[PDB]
Amino acid sequence: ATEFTPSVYSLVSKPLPSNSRPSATLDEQAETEDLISQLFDLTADPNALVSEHGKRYSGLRKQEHTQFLASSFFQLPGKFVSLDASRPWLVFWTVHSLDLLGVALDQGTKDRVVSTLLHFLSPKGGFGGGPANSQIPHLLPTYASVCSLAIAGNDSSTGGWKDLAAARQSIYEFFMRCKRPDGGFVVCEGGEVDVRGTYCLLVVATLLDIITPELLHNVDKFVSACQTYEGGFACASFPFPEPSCRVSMAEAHGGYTSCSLNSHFLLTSVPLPSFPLSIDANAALRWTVLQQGEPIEGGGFRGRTNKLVDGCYSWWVGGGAPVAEELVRREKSRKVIPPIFNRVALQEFTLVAAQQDPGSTGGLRDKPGKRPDQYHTCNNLSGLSIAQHKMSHSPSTVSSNRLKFDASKGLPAVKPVAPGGGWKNEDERQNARREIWANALGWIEEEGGEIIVGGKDNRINTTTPVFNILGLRLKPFINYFYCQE
């Protein structure tokens, strides 16, 4: 199971060579190598049977991390005003982290989460970063709010899902107001255009059964043209004057590669002709694995070439690996296994370098020397989950899902903005609902593929690739909106 995933402590650690050519990049790289390798040198190898004397123990300090997150349910200091337009993210980072850590909220606290988020929902459509009498709707808090309601809500009259169901038409209308002719979306009225908006929108549209042909037109082309010569994806593509061509607008980054791979994967479920336009999956897989750092930097991921490793890219880059793998498998299949990244080294980075020092605030962090925060806690743990559990998209599981789908059950069809913007007839709309639902529920944990570095007390729960919520949350949530059971 680990023949091709060597431990960082078993490899020779050496600095990135200078070639006798100093530069500012290399100065900061070498400083970061010293910082990470020194902490590994002070820490007992997690794979050892009895822990060494005098060294730090690297076990996952779940109770410290739980108490770090507890402040979300009382109050946050004044410095959090920089996140006052992102309060649904503060909710998501907290409640998804507690799910991964296996800590249950009581019903009263869940009801407070639900009630807070419903105050962020505008009647005209979508969630804002705060109360609807204060902030306008935005695609990114709409994803964070919808996912948080999947984690904390339920189907009762106080559970929030009923309110989401009643908002489906207005959320759809908000999404269509955001839509650009070239396939991009603004994140809000007058806002920026990049694949973060596309990802957040496609996740929500998939979960709530509000996908239409008019919503999706050119969305595949916008995303495909974000892929760079390095194989990852940039923030956006520019349409030159439907357009004569599209050009990517910056360098490949883990955050935008995650959003692009996940968006493209969601579009492959949609039964439209010649849709979605293909990406280069081999190049994206190559870019992904090349971002995993060397042993001297603890095997964490960097977000782009020649920058620094950072624990949050365990999710953004590591979590894209199963998606790229599946796209590669499909292409090999169309023409006619060992782990694809070092699943052991990534766990070692999480346990040894990304946890706050013991006996302190708790929380997980970017790198040693950085304060922990809720965002790095969520994304370190999400990436740790992908490393611990071998995730794959199972064709036989999708086939079983198709066989049980009941197309005669569901919520009212979206009314399109343009007269011919919907599906052609009920046969086509129901075929689309079946495919989109069945593929959304196609991710599995592979039997016998678990690797828990440091022993079973380090195990956390399994997240889902693409959505990043637990499968035990995803299934009853999406079943609610498609009226399946």
């Binding site: 606290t109 009498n133 010569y229 920058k307």
Partner: protein
């Protein structure tokens, strides 16, 4: 000390509106008196849809305290256009925000909307400002994406001259001279030389580009940015790998490597081995390629042991 807005003569007609997130919200933030007071009056201003100078002042107060507050930036831009305010003065304010380290996606997008609406007939002054702004962080992702947008938008309008493109390549070359490991500047070179619609593609330009890439590799053999640019270049133009192998083979033990390699250059260079393996595949020598992938997996690039084993198995 602080004078509440309720006691200010200029605001006496306005009844503030409290934040409404319910009786016991989760993730509440302990706001300063100044921030709560300003948002209390912003809620009232936005509710009555007032477009005024006092509203404009209020939005600046708020975004100075929270530069990521997208709702207030949206309101600010609508104030600027409704009142026909000087957009050049607002650009000077955005320059000051950068100096004062007030930054976010929202400030960068506000700047983009200003340039779009001003629509200068020649954007040279903004190009030169953006160049200088990279001094505190030469890899700022927002800045590089904005520079791409600026040249793409104004070239669509026909407003980028050949002299302007030429001095942009000169500037890019200098950025990579100062730090050849700046992957952001490599990405910019790709736009200037390969992907922008106006780029030249001729036998000469392909020869010039290959010379630049190979010189860059020989200067910094372990620079991943240069290797990725080489592989993307050859793939994009469907150019064979074998004819270039003489310049690559010395790293696996047109411009050629230094006869003594530079100091601190341990061999082999893993991406040189990847080149060699892919060259064998180009020659349909799958067993030779498999042997190179096997050495990458077990000896020379062991962090990627599983990926290189995957590539080895594909050879069969």
């Amino acid at each position: 000390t602080y004078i509440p807005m309720s006691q200010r003569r200029s605001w006496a007609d306005v009844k503030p509106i409290m934040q409404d997130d319910g009786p016991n919200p989760v993730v509440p933030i302990m706001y300063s008196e100044e921030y709560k007071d300003a948002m209390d009056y912003f809620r009232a201003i936005a509710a009555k849809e007032e477009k005024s100078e006092r509203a404009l002042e209020l939005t600046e107060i708020i975004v100075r305290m929270n530069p990521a507050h997208y709702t207030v930036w949206q309101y600010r831009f609508s104030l600027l256009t409704s009142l026909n305010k000087s957009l050049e003065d607002e650009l000077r304010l955005m320059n000051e925000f950068a100096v004062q380290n007030l930054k976010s996606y929202q400030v960068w997008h506000h700047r983009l909307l200003l340039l779009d609406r001003i629509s200068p007939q020649d954007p040279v002054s903004e190009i030169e400002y953006i160049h200088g702004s990279l001094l505190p962080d030469p890899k700022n992702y927002h800045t590089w994406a904005y520079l791409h947008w600026l040249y793409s938008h104004f070239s669509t309008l026909g407003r980028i001259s050949e002299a302007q493109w030429g001095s942009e390549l000169d500037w890019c070359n200098e950025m990579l001279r100062v730090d050849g490991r700046n992957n952001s500047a490599w990405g910019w070179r790709w736009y200037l030389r390969v992907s922008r619609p106006g780029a030249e593609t001729s036998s000469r330009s392909l020869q010039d580009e290959l010379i630049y890439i190979l010189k860059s590799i020989h200067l910094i053999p372990h620079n991943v940015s240069a290797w990725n640019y080489l592989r993307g270049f050859l793939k994009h133009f469907s150019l064979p790998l074998v004819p270039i192998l003489p310049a690559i083979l010395p790293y696996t033990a047109f411009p050629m490597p230094s006869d003594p390699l530079p100091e601190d250059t341990p061999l082999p260079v893993p991406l040189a081995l990847e080149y060699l393996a892919d060259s064998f595949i180009e020659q349909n020598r799958v067993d030779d390629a498999a042997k190179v992938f096997e050495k990458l997996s077990s000896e020379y690039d062991q962090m990627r042991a599983g990926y290189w084993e995957f590539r080895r198995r594909e050879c069969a």
